[model samples]
Target: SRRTYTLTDYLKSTFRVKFYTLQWISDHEYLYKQENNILLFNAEYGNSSIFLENSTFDELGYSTNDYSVSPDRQFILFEYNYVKQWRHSYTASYDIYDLNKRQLITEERIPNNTQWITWSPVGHKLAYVWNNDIYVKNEPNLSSQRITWTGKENVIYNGVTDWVYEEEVFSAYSALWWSPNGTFLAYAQFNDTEVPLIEYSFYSDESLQYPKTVRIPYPKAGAENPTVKFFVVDTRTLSPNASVTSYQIVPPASVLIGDHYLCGVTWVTEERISLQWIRRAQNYSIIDICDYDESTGRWISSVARQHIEISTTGWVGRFRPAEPHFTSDGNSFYKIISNEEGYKHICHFQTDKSNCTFITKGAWEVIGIEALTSDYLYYISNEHKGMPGGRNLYRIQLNDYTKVTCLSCELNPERCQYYSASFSNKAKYYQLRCFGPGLPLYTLHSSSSDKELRVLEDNSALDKMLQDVQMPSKKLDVINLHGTKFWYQMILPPHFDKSKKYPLLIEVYAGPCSQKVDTVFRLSWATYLASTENIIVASFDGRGSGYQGDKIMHAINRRLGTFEVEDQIEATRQFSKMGFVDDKRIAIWGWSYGGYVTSMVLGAGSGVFKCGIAVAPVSKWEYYDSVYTERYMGLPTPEDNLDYYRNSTVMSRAENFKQVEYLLIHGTADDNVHFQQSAQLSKALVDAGVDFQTMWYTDEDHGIASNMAHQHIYTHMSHFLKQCFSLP
Candidate 1:
């Protein structure tokens, strides 16, 4: 029977439910749930509730709003944001609280937008990057001295990463490595003195009648990158006596110049650290382990450098190194996720200066990996045969890598499950939450070995509220494009039928290091609009989409728009071949790199895509950040690679926009891609007499969805798409 429930009653019943978000303590005696401001702790003993004394806005010079607990559950670190300054946040402080005492230990002031806090293995100290310099706090003293001094505003940055490192290398902070004993700290140093600086201006009419230009270091694609180096510091030494030593990992003169990156750094032992190094040309890469001796002050190479030779037949393979963890018995093994075999898989290395074994082999991608115990390595893998967005937990024995067993059975596979398992302790308990297409969101079970826990949170009221509204419908298909097969998901109208022809809207993000096609509940906002508006919404994993093989994925490195556009256009054409699709009214939309491609498709493909909605698009390659663009296209300094930059830039063909309908949307306060891209393109379009519309969100950053504004913007977009596509 159908029943209705109130929101208050629904929240009351579902609030205590130990859903997927509720992290279970290792002993399975307590559950931790963070909902916005409140951090609720529910004990298994008598179902008691303990409200953590730490409120979100406690004025300890720090805030619980941005704090998190360490993996060992020993320390709680929090960040407080004060104000914003050009492309960064200023006036922030971090505080560490001792979990044992349940008291604040120390509060440290961090400068230049501190982020990416990582705890040392021993859990005695914490390391984080402030400004560009990496800082460490030992003994939990707020007044402790700075461990690193290489960071400056636009110059040498030690232990912390720069703009390019954060955006392109897919890493926000550059600090890495703490010896097993927590005696030494190792980190990456970035020197961006040579890279060109692009300045931006902000007008404050309240104080001045004219706008003022703010000069900051901004590197475009095919530009000089910040020279990166590795350094080690002895934290055991006191402030003035804390002698700092540095080693040249990638020297300025020896660097590949145009196409190089220090993807990640790993420590094998207290003295030895391994680096995943890649040259700019993408031709050669290596995993070199270097040993730093504090006593002798000399660096030694431990493992003979393992080189990855690019095949002349196809694109070079990329290796994504997971954070290295030592096994229980002290045997070191590095976890690596690679797509060399046409699909993503997790591999374990013996660290014996030889071959690495493929520990977890399958078609699925390893999303998250837990610590390796004596018997098994537990991990979360996305292996849903029918449902792409769902993830399942599994365990495989250490020596025996072939056999895989699912910890959560497929019979109850609707919702995702995860565990914060500790390897130091053999306790294997996980918190499980489940929700299917038509099922109400609820927490199903929480189990260790002893007791089978029942439902924690049941959102029966939400189910009742959604009963009147129809959920979105989705269909998956394989679309063949230019000899390569790509997966595409289509969302149909709520009342979809075979006899009706519908307008098609393609939502895409055709960039490197990102994928649009996935099995997650999120990343499907376009589908929601389709179901609600009686239009066809679709997404295709074109070339450069990740998780596929190297050849199929990184084919559009230097040539971005050429192949991605071809695949997208071909996918739309094939979709139109179906009786339900309307080809003439098809449209494309994207943000950031996807926005760049959307503009290119409308300009280059001519009749293929009728209209496009571009948000924060890079109109020209020369306007983008240095680390990201130069990794694919060589440096513009050589003058020879100008053709590559021109070819990849969307503005090169802005004159061809005479026939296509375009809506350019950007934020006035955008820092990453800059709002000038929209102005430049709009000016060019005006000069060429092309009809186009533009919208600028005031005081908004690169992501214009800051304050419930994305809903209004998306609603307008939905209306626009319906009108343009002639959909009722």
Candidate 2:
């Protein structure tokens, strides 16, 4: 007899999958972790050698979280005691291990709780941020030289990003860049002294007497944003005889005339650099190529070498402007921008020109430019069969734009559609990571011949383990809404009968430039629900979803909760009309942006849903961050977009929520979408004389990622759904 998937099966991770996390050391050698030990593998031959033995660390009785290999392979950086701050920011303790000597360097150890750290590109020199100041070390065993003396606790940040930049702009925690030759260091300093703060209470443990109030310099919509300054320091001139001096790289006059953010910093050459700045409105962005003037010891940018990008239909590139990928000679670069047809494409630009030549153009958008070589530029796009949800790797020749090659589409076309590639140091070897229509397969290939070298990880064990389990089947389909093709996916119950009706649950996360329906394989709670509870769990990518084009994504430009919310209701009606779905037992749930959509759908008064759940959702646009909110809906002032901002809130529809069963969940210490959002929604429901259920996790962030907490929340939701669906 076959067994269906259960909650315990998911909680305990009985059917876990494995992947090869590889870090390429050379053209043919890469490092992989196996059972707490590191192994170096040769791509040509299927042979592996131990790089770091687990017994070495077991003898020292140290619990290392992560490690990094230096560029020259002479030393290794060991990381421990990692403490996560936000989404991509963390603090860790670092130690240097001499790979050649086979010993740890105990002298001049890195300070505990280092905010950011990294090795130079060509040597064993190190750079890190500590206590909001920048520090540089000439060697692993040498003392660090402090670069900044004006660093303060919450007012100034030298080499690391603040909360807004880390979460919204860079998607990284560090703001430092090293030169190609390791002779210069460039960094951005953020001043958050004028920004507003969002404070909340955190109840940690039973032994605590009072709740702790956490404060962060967070700017809401139309609030005072953080100011920034960029600087470059010459590492060769650092000495004890004289103090080190830094040259300020000022922004263009057009950017400094208004409120702006430092969006990007690129080291073009040993003496050349590029910086991009975007105003607070985010509709326009400017790029300036600055040259380090050795005569004056300053960075210079002439007005002739500047480029400006403006968007009249919507905001700039996906989030901020896309980063430019420079060639080896630093004469030209390639970037992804929206074409005339509203689709994102690759454009080639010269160093001193404002116009760019389009290298790739079509209805589909290029996801990103992966690697750049003298002959070919490798990229990922959804050009296979014109499917917007599928991604495949391709390369185009530099001399002839028409000389294009599909690298990964032809190989196992049926099993692999969503693909990612990681190239070695000089683009000689690449690993194709197939994320899947089927099982994930990692294969190594030679870029020169495009031939498969060997298999890295085929997931044969996971494939074998899944054979005995009664897993649910997935179906991908498209539906026409307003003459546009919108995609949706469904997880059907195992051994399904089309004549029988099953309960439906709509999983939603309809945000700007977001794609919910894709070919990637995942075994989430939806899988467990369809397998054991016999409920059809489906997701619909309606208007405002990404990857199709700018037209569909910008449909809800100024209005936040209009088209996205209505499309979900319409899609639910379409799903309920199907023969396999029960029209009376439909439900909806979402987290974050999806949570906002779920709440909006439940409060739409459409009578399409019986119950819904929302976790850490934004209740109002005014309560969100300035950069993200203003990019879609302008300033939120009386002159621009204030009407729609006031009307699009979830609280305005609180009366309609009385007709449906709703559950609102939030963590009390959520920094991204503050708990104040849910608090306001609770007050609105109370004012309307409506009754709804709510839950608050104490001292938890946005993720609420503790093991016991997640289990408790999911199990509680399961019980609630079982009661609502009339299941035993």
Candidate 3:
């Protein structure tokens, strides 16, 4: 069964297995779309149905991309041709078919460029965004009314979010939200007239003519940020010009006085709406919950505001803002927030109730709430075995103080320690996903009995083939520097022995709230380096890395490059202290934010590393966006913290990199971290007379991970590291 194979064999995957994605229609009923058929499986009846025929797809021009059923299951919204605009924004066609009639509702056809859509909670009502405007309909084929009038190009946007909101703030394209009772619709209107455009060329080789230009409304650091207004439209009234009748949920005076972001939105009840607003600095958040006074027709009279100020050393949140999850009763909400103790903990907050009580607490963090049942609150946490990387499913009774159980604790951990679970609507069933420290396994589990139902993907095919290949041995441990423990993961060379020395490569991504050392498994470049090339690939979760505590994570707060970069150097030095490490041949590399740190570490003048690769590194904070950059490193104004910005740049430290070997890589058509970031570093390196190798991935995004060349990108990096270490 054991047979050694080349990189090609390592790349060719035998695992074609996938669990059908299930959508919960009820406490028992669920839908799974397979090919042309949608299977409706229910526990009550123990039945499954191919609800729609193949001819139904033949009637429609496009195949099913996604489809959603109405609350009553009378209507099915079949979607196709999803052209993505950004992270959360995509324009797709919807053909609402009458499930009982077995025919498409031809009268409800929406035209092209209808940016977004959302289904109502109670009925078959639909609310969608067209162009920059918002539209809502009570029922299919009835009529759609324009709920916004101020939506204009690059100036006023309604329902659909602007670039910054989708990328950094809300992490969504749909700025609109539906009420629980379907009485009102709450949406944000972003005003970006003052924000300037960032233009890049979209060249077409197939065309005989000149290249075309694409523009994005981007607000870089210190640039004019978009102004936003939160509005609630009373959807019950569908008269013409009824949008003008809507009232504005005026932002708190604190946010109104300054340029701010509407990051979070929640509709508690028909009249009670809550919103999360963060200032430009992002250290403080003003959470305001408002109750619409029908008498006064305003939200000003009845409102409650809660302010949370995070660490000055770093930004708040794990990555994006942790949205508060509300209970079905609408009485209390749960959120993952950092307290006096380190890491994230679940805190239950009741409206106007006494100060929030800790639902779960420990030295470790509760990553997220999985499912909230009436009696139990299901969650995932690293509260087990003190391993920051391994995340296991957990369940705790809402009332019981000490009844937390790790449902996936005995989850075949030798085969896979890192596990994740997706619970059914009622938490009666869950798909237990064993990620890795070993072979990946997907198993179905029963929530009540905590027993495995079936093994969906045993990954036996890959396991049999992996028997002969010398897979690298992995070790997880901690290193102490000045009495503080830092988590480090190492993929030791296969056939490992302490008597023999091996070249080391430090893989880094020490950005704000970033954790490099995780339990996720991969047939990766690091694996290839360790097994095939005899290189010890290591990763350390240092300062600015999350799940440890704010203190460990915020070590490089306002000053980005200082501590994060230095920590890498310290890690490399500590790794050398162990025997069998070829200290002189050690190298380090990273991508994007990690790339920035890679460049910073190499340019730190520490002389700890032999060489490092920087892939699409951010040269300076000024070149980055407003919402993200300004959150960690403040406004780069002359009167503001200019010194911090200047010192944090990779370009400014270019001279310090003269002693080390560096390979710079970037994609020309990178939309997120523009290629200009790498270009600046090259120009600065040239000016400093520092000779370095540079590679350009033509027309690729920030990842440089597109097309067939993505494989070669990693291979080339492998070649570079090998050459730097003088490996055969």
Candidate 4:
């Protein structure tokens, strides 16, 4: 009666769900875009007004890529001619427009090709980084004052992250942070002079006869990392002051003795800032709370106020150390860290004490602290029935730690389990994002009463459109593997029957702290494979996966490709035992780290997987970035983890690929996991007399950014899967 979820629909995004992107300017007001027209909506009154007409930018004769509204709502910075850089970095031209005057400011416009720019938290003041130097403008139409004179290309970077830090550490391009009151600017400067460079070719277009060589300062495993320095500058000093200077805050002595990274930066108040530093081994981290000394015009940090976080079994929380949520008074803060039971929980920390009191503790872990208020604190956790894959927002009273209320667990329990929240400026109102086991629903709520005010986007149009489509059904359940509970999910074909067998595709991303079996719904390539191709796509959260505990998440410490890869093969064997799965047609695939797992599993010669596809896979530990690889595999030298590193490579098992069909895909200009990884693995396969398939995306980075390239890759993989399964 209904049509199947076709590949065409998946590639063309025909069934894409609409999401309302909102910017909460106040407690009861938010801004959104409609038909390229900017509109401000009042949540309390359920009313809307045009903040900026579409004709405003249309008449400027410039295509705006994006725009940011000033905190005071008086100026709008329009970004145009945007060019993409590695990962989170980008360059663009900016123009500040006067909203009240309805005219563009013609004087002191932002310089062209600005690397990064941001408005102050309280005003129209602009801070940007251009040509590796930091600049600050007191007013939108005022001249900029250069803050740093040490900025040098490929040597020094001010107010911006270098290649490794941008991709691995902060996940951001700009490293500058403004105080809550916008009085002080705290930034981190990176020196990449001693770091090694990763060089690759960029074949941009067909007309280009000679390919361009691109070199980036990327630190591989056991390589020299970029040196970092933290600094703070007072914006008030730039007001016609002949000599403007910035104060340098040195890292703690424990961190300075070894290679370290500046991980976290938080502003507790106008006079206090917090910085987190981690050693090169990544097993230890410390948060130094610095107070600005008004008498000496310097920043001072005391050893008694430093919070230490050390991981004996594995690296710190998730990727980096957990960030602290400071109270409004800046006297105390809360952060999610491991408890005595090896479970992550929220703990209260006083400004002057190193010891912290645990606020929430259980077998499950707290994901993050959402907001901190006077009377209560809001957080997201997976404590509902101790389900590691489920997330719910909860509120705990500050006075009574035991008084906890589940804010999202009871609301539409069947349709939603994993939830995230966006609170208003003052925590008076919040927007709840209910991602599914059902269609995603966005609703506005009152924080005080915990009541739903209105539905922002129910995605009812997408729901109605999907009524006639034969959508794939998901099964979220757990399995007992070797006396331990492991979670797995399966996207089953419509009208699935145990009597009829179907091909199985194991979608694997078995890296440390990785999770694949979650309640959130998705309409992805798996949906098309399940509904149209009648393939059961399954994912397993096996050993070294996240959210369960350290015992489970840290199982593969210093052994990157061991337990995680074996667990995937074991999970595939279990799936093959089910009567509904065809034992001879089981396949697997993954991207990035997942790609590494796919290749490792295929090379294991398990005979459980008939074929597999790996895209942008890491072939060796030494070829990856130092921050990420060293965190999991330690150093790659003979004195450290050299033995395990040598034994865990996919190339070492090249002859095993002769028993399984393999397809390898890589983006030639991938910055994070270099194309050299796949190139080396292919060379090993060739030397081993193993035949395989490979495709390279010209001038493409990770994710194969080109839309047509994405379609072509998926289409090619689909054909490969069909051929293996003998399907039309």
- Among these predictions, the greatest lDDT belongs to 4
Residue 342 CA displacement from its true place in model 3, Å: 3.6
Q: Which is the better candidate, 3 or 4, if ranked by TM-score?
A: 4
lDDT of 1 by residue, 18-72 (tens): 2335544444444354454424444344264543553534675444445566656
Models ranked on lDDT? 4, 2, 3, 1
lDDT of 4 by residue, 1-728 (tens): 56899999999999878777788998778888899988998877668999988878763445988989999999998999788898899889988999989788889878887999999999888889998988999888778888888888788999999998998899999999988888888889999999999999998888999999999999999999999999898888786566675799988899989899999999998999999999999999999999999988799989987988999999998999999899999889999999889998999999889889999988999999988889999999999977888899999999999899999998989888999999888888888899998899998889878888889899999999899999989998888888899999999999888799899999999888889999998889999999999999999998899998898999999998999999888888988999999999999999998999999999998878899999999999999999999999999999989999999999998999999999999999998899999999999999999999999988788979689998999999999999999998
Where's the lowest-lDDT run of ten residues in candidate 1? 1-10
**TM-scores of the models, in the order given:** 0.83, 0.98, 0.93, 0.99
Clashing pairs in 4: none
Q: Is candidate 2 or candidate 4 better by lDDT?
A: 4
| Local lDDT at 392 for model 3 | 89
User: Relative to the unseen true structure, what is the Cα RMSD of model 1?
Assistant: 5.2
Judge candidate 4 against the unseen true structure and give its global Cα lDDT, from 0 to 1. Answer: 0.91
Q: How many clashes show up in model 3?
A: 0
Q: Give the TM-score of candidate 3.
A: 0.93
Q: State the lDDT of candidate 3 residue by residue for 575-640, as single tens digits.
A: 987899988899999998889999988888888899999888888989899999988878897787
Give one digit per residue, the lDDT tens place, for model 2 in 1-728.
27988888887788877777899988788888898888988877769999999776743324788889988889999888888999999998888999999899999989987999989888788999999999999888888888887788778999999999999999999999988888899999999999999999977798889888888999999999999999998898887665877888878988898899899998888988999998888889988989988987788998867888888888888877888999988888999988889988999998898789989989898999998998989999999989888899999999999999999998988889999999988888899999888889999999989998887788899999888888999888988898988999999999999999999989999999999899998878888999899999999999899888889888888888889889999998999989999999999999999889999899999999999989899999999999899999988889989999999899999999989988899989999999999999999999999999998887778897778878877888887787778877
